[PDB]
Amino acid sequence: MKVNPSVKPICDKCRVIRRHGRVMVICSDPRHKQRQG
Amino acid sequence: AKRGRKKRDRKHSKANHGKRPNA
Amino acid sequence: LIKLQIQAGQANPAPPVGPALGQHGVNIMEFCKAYNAATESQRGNVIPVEITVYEDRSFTFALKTPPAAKLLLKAAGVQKGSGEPHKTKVAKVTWDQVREIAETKKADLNANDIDAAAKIIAGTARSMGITVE
Amino acid sequence: MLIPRKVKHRKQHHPEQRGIASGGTSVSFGDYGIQALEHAYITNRQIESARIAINRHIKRGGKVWINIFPDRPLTKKPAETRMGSGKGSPEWWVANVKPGRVLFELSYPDEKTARDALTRAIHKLPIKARIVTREE
Amino acid sequence: MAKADKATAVADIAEQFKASTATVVTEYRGLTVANLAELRRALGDSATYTVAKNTLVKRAASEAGIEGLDELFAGPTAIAFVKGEAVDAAKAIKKFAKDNKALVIKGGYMDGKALSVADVEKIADL
Amino acid sequence: SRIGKQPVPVPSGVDVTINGQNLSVKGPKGTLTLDVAEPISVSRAEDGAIVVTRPDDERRSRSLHGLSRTLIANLVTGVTEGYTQKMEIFGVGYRVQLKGQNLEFALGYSHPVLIEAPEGITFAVESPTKFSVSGIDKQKVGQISAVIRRLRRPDPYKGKGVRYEGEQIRRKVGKT
Amino acid sequence: TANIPNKLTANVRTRTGKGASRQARRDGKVPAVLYGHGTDPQHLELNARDFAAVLRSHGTNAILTLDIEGTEQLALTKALDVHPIRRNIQHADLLVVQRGEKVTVEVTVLVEGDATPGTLVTQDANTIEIEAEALSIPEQLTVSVEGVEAGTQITAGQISLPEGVNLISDPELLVVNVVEAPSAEALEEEGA
RNA sequence: GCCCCUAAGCGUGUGCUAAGUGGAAAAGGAUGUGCAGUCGCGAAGACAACCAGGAGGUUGGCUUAGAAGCAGCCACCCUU
RNA sequence: ACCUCGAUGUCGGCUCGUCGCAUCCUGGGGCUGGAGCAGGUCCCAAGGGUUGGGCUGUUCGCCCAUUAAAGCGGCACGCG
Ligand SMILES: [Mg+2]
Ligand SMILES: [Mg+2]
Ligand SMILES: [Mg+2]
Ligand SMILES: [Mg+2]
Ligand SMILES: [Mg+2]
Ligand SMILES: [Mg+2]
Ligand SMILES: [Mg+2]
Ligand SMILES: [Mg+2]
Ligand SMILES: [Mg+2]
Ligand SMILES: [Mg+2]
Ligand SMILES: [Mg+2]
Ligand SMILES: [Mg+2]
Ligand SMILES: [Mg+2]
Ligand SMILES: [Mg+2]
Ligand SMILES: [Mg+2]
Ligand SMILES: [Mg+2]
Ligand SMILES: [Mg+2]
Ligand SMILES: [Mg+2]
Ligand SMILES: [Mg+2]
Ligand SMILES: [Mg+2]
Ligand SMILES: [Mg+2]
Ligand SMILES: [Mg+2]
Ligand SMILES: [Mg+2]
Ligand SMILES: [Mg+2]
Ligand SMILES: [Mg+2]
Ligand SMILES: [Mg+2]
Ligand SMILES: [Mg+2]
Ligand SMILES: [Mg+2]
Ligand SMILES: [Mg+2]
Ligand SMILES: [Mg+2]
Ligand SMILES: [Mg+2]
Ligand SMILES: [Mg+2]
Ligand SMILES: [Zn+2]
């Protein structure tokens, strides 16, 4: 779970979601899982 | 640095019209 | 149902061949002897062989024709292809060799006639960059 | 690092930051260019950083133009010294960039790679900037 | 895909039918381009084997008396225009369906009649 | 919305009661309750259908519409058929048994572990390794299935633990 | 070359000045000045949106029919005032024309073609000068590049001119310069 | 300045915001949302989803233990 | 160079503490170039705890034995 002020779709399987007022990225690969913060 | 921020920002009071003495 | 390219008078190397289909569960010795007999009935060409694999491990060899670029490399007489196709024109290819290679690849192609095969061969020679006139 | 060969006066006043660019406001050499949005001083190192960033990206072919030269100097006086006792000595060589100016110019076949290269360049700059083509 | 390209395809398929003596409509869902290209070797000798979008075909089929083939557009549409002689395409498709078993023939058309599987097999035998 | 504009059919073995925004459905599997939101209007088409309607197409209306429609559809499907989930476990000596209604697992820890089927859900073990869970509520069935799945830590190396059947686990190789 | 005149409505300005111009730009009106051989300067206002659309459709050098209080007048877009930053249209310059008039016009040249892969082509002269007729001014002049190799210099002469079209610029202008593509080494050398 | 502290408006009409933003802040990141606008495709049925394919030359040439559509470089071609 | 020169005592150490978390240990997680053991890095977490000596006025630093650990900081570089 990366936590960075920037979040980007590393691979095209990545999707960008907003949960509870914060932006994160979900993907099948757990490496690409990241959060904007 | 908080105090300078406070004073320079209270300069923006609608009555002060963007100016206060001593910045 | 896998594919490899193996030379005319060569068989049983460790890196390219052995583990390549030994992890496919296929008998390597019988394939080696049969392909060797067939390719020494060819006498002259590196051949792409396709292994067709079954559940009981029985195998069948599909002997397509020697590769079109390899056929053009042996056709133009040069051992090595070009490093910069259309810029470094190492050799030359004639339309009669084009027609012979067109017949062979007609045996290998989806081409219906000679001219389509010749055009395919022209594209193949261009891919590696040998002058075609 | 581009440094002017010689200057008539080595110690100058600061280049004043009022107004928008009048000249150099159009793309003139390459297919694309970078247009500046802020007021700034741009140093040697920023320019060479951005230029190497472009060159690494486009790699093979295409040519780049640099429309601005860092010929106005800026001095600094040695640290641990009080105020006064004369002006400092020049260290860093800058150019005065106003909004509307075009900084870098590119001639390259592919559009997407070009935009990516200019984006890599822009990220190296201290100012807001945008990509402008020769189409109106 | 744009409407101009669809109109061009409609006109061209109509023209190819007016040059065709009879037609066969089949389903291809479940075959690969390998055996399909082998079929184009087989069918490309005399007839013509193609595939078109049904909404394109019905504007292409409204031209001639193949307006009776609108009800055979259900499922993927593979059209065999028999140009050389008449029966070649039917028997070739019948043998290709016997070997593959992945084809279903929606029907055929000729002589002012659109005809079902049994009648096509009759003409394929006759 | 787009989903929320498909009527919910009422099969014959189904009984429906509507009280304003409240809804209740009774069938062979039992009775279930539901409540819809203020923006959404609920009607029963006398042809044995359910109609979900919204006055507006703003954010709240659009989002809530399909939600409510699918929710009532799930509610009726629960009392018509029900809900069934399948579990199946991997690992040597990984033991699953039923004690009455309660489920017992032995997944390699020193002690065995127990889980209790809440009211409205039942367990059925047919193999020592795999079993199933039946229930009225889709949400409750999913919840219990999830908590069952969570019991053992995921293993990309040897893949020990409980699994759903359809799911596939990512697996790396510990080379060293 | 026969292009249709474009129909725009103009209304004569009531006030002139920076305040009037700012006010007019504020509500979607663009100020223009009509001056020609008629020696009558008209300060007019145009719809910004429609004028911009006409410009986009038919380039910078477009021939216009203006509706000065019912009067249909032929005019030419002699010059445009664009903001350097937000790309508006600030002011327009319109030249009265009668049919069959010799006109001096900047026309954009566009380079199309497939140069050889080891070639980079640079478009050096952005726009070229033409003497033509008011009703027959091109929108673009096309230069084709195929098989261009080594240093292939295309000057202003080689551009094909249709009937009634005359080249005013000196034909030496390198409109397109064909050069060797810069190397992976050459790029790391310029600017250092 | 006008809800109460605290004198005067929990004023009227049309919108906007969900962040207590209001009632501090950068590069930069981001399917929040409103308004307005340009281009594409779309009933000849568009997009999404549901089902069938995505073949042959060929493993294109160099480099390479190795290079086969998937470390790298050049062209970026041909049939059904 | 804005308070203090008709006085605002200045380093280390001792006694006594109080607060911040930018967490040293203990607690909870995510990812791994995480087989296990043992790790790396990021997030949450301030309840409690965090040694005794040799040299140096020393701060600091090195060293000797241990410990789960021998945290960093502000409070007139706390406190005559
Ligand atoms: Mg980053
Ligand atoms: Mg500070
Ligand atoms: Mg000030
Ligand atoms: Mg001045
Ligand atoms: Mg300029
Ligand atoms: Mg100037
Ligand atoms: Mg910047
Ligand atoms: Mg009061
Ligand atoms: Mg008020
Ligand atoms: Mg009120
Ligand atoms: Mg009010
Ligand atoms: Mg606030
Ligand atoms: Mg901010
Ligand atoms: Mg951004
Ligand atoms: Mg291939
Ligand atoms: Mg490879
Ligand atoms: Mg004193
Ligand atoms: Mg005193
Ligand atoms: Mg004293
Ligand atoms: Mg203390
Ligand atoms: Mg913390
Ligand atoms: Mg922990
Ligand atoms: Mg951890
Ligand atoms: Mg603590
Ligand atoms: Mg407590
Ligand atoms: Mg402290
Ligand atoms: Mg003190
Ligand atoms: Mg201290
Ligand atoms: Mg002290
Ligand atoms: Mg004392
Ligand atoms: Mg003391
Ligand atoms: Mg004291
Ligand atoms: Zn991903």
Strand D63-66 relative to strand D102-107: parallel, antiparallel, unpaired? antiparallel
Query: For chain E, where are the alpha helices, taking DSSP H only?
Result: 3-18, 33-43, 54-61, 88-100, 117-125
Q: How far are the Cα atoms of B1, F104, F121, F136, F160 from residue F87, in angstroms, in the given order?
A: 60, 13, 15, 18, 13
Q: Strand G127-133 vs strand G102-114: parallel, antiparallel, or unpaired?
A: antiparallel
| β strands within chain G, DSSP E | 6-12, 29-34, 42-47, 63-68, 71-81, 91-96, 102-114, 119-123, 127-133, 140-146, 152-154, 166-167, 176-180
Query: Which residue intervals of chain G are DSSP H helices?
Result: 18-26, 48-58
Displacement of CA F58 from its chain's centroid (Å): 30
3-state secondary structure of G51: helix
Those residues whose beta carbon sits under 5 angstroms from the ion ligand 7 are: D 125
Locate the chain E residue with the closest alpha carbon to C113. Answer: E41
E-chain residues near C112 (CB < 8 A): 41, 44
Experimental method: cryo-EM
Listed as ranges, the nucleotides of chain H within 7 A of a protein C-beta are: 1, 19, 24, 26-34, 40-46, 51-63, 65-68, 73-80
Tell which residue, G37, G40, G42, has the closest CA to residue G66: G42
- Check CB contact under 8 Å for E37 and C110: yes
d(CA D75, CA D96): 15
CA distance G77 to G82: 13
**Phi/psi zone of residue D67: left (φ > 0), alpha (ψ -120 to 50 degrees), beta?**
alpha
**Fold for the domain defined by D23-135:** Aldehyde Oxidoreductase; domain 3 (3.90.1170)
CA–CA dist E7, E14 (Å, integer): 11
Helix (H) or strand (E) holding C49, with range, is strand C47-53
Nearest residue to A29 via CA among A18, A9, A13, A5: A13
Question: Are F154 and F172 spatial neighbours (Cβ–Cβ below 8 Å)?
Answer: no
DSSP letter at B12 equals: T
Say how far apart CA E117 and CA E115 lie, in whole Å. Answer: 7
Structural contact between residues G48 and G89, judged by C-beta atoms closer than 8 angstroms: yes
Which residue in this structure is represented by tokens 């003409």?
A: E123
User: C23: Cβ under 7 Å from strand H?
Assistant: no
Q: Are D7 and D96 in contact (CB under 8 A)?
A: no
**E115 contacts: CB under 8 Å, gap ≥ 6:** E107, E108, E109, E123
| Number of domains into which chain E is organized | 1
Pairing assessment for the beta strands A2-4 and A34-36 based on DSSP bridges: parallel
d(CA G190, CA G182): 10
At residue G71, φ and ψ (nearest 5 deg) are: -85, 125
> Residue D32 belongs to what H/E stretch?
strand D32-36
Complete domains list, chain C, with CATH: 1-64 (3.30.1550.10), 65-133 (1.10.10.250)
Contacts of G116 (CB under 8 A, 6+ apart): G147, G148, G149
Paired tokens of G117: 């892969």
CB atoms within 10 A of CB C16: 13
Closest CA to F25 of F10, F36, F38, F37: F10
User: Helix (H, G, I), strand (E, B), or coil: what is residue E63?
Assistant: coil
Residue G164 burial by Cβ neighbours in a 10 Å radius (0-12, 13-18, 19+): middle
Rounded CA gap, G47 and G51, in Å?
A: 6
Asked if the Cβ of residue C18 lies within 7 A of any atom of strand H, the reply is no
Sign of CA dihedral F20, F26, F31, F32: negative
> Bridge partners of E31?
none
Q: What is the CATH number of the domain that holds E7?
A: 3.30.70.1730
Give the count of beta carbons closer than 10 Å to the beta carbon of residue C67.
Answer: 18
- Quick one: resolution in A? 4.1
CA of F174 to C1' of I36 (A): 11
Kindly list the residues of chain E whose beta carbon comes within 8 Å of any beta carbon in chain C. 37, 41, 44
Interface of C with E in 66-105 (CB under 8 A): none
Calculate the alpha carbon distances from G192 to D49, D51, G16, G84 in Å: 11, 10, 52, 31
Tokens in use for F147? 């908590």
The neighbouring-strand residues paired with C3 are C50
Alpha helix stretches (DSSP H) within chain F: 59-80, 138-149
Which DSSP string corresponds to F34-81?
EE--SS-EEEEETTTEEEEE-S--SHHHHHHHHHHHHHHHHHHHHHHT
Do residues F32 and F24 touch, judged by C-beta distance below 8 A?
yes
Amino acid at A37: G
Domain with E24, as residue range(s), is 1-126
Map out the domains of chain F with their CATH numbers.
15-83 (3.90.930.12), 84-164 (3.90.930.12)
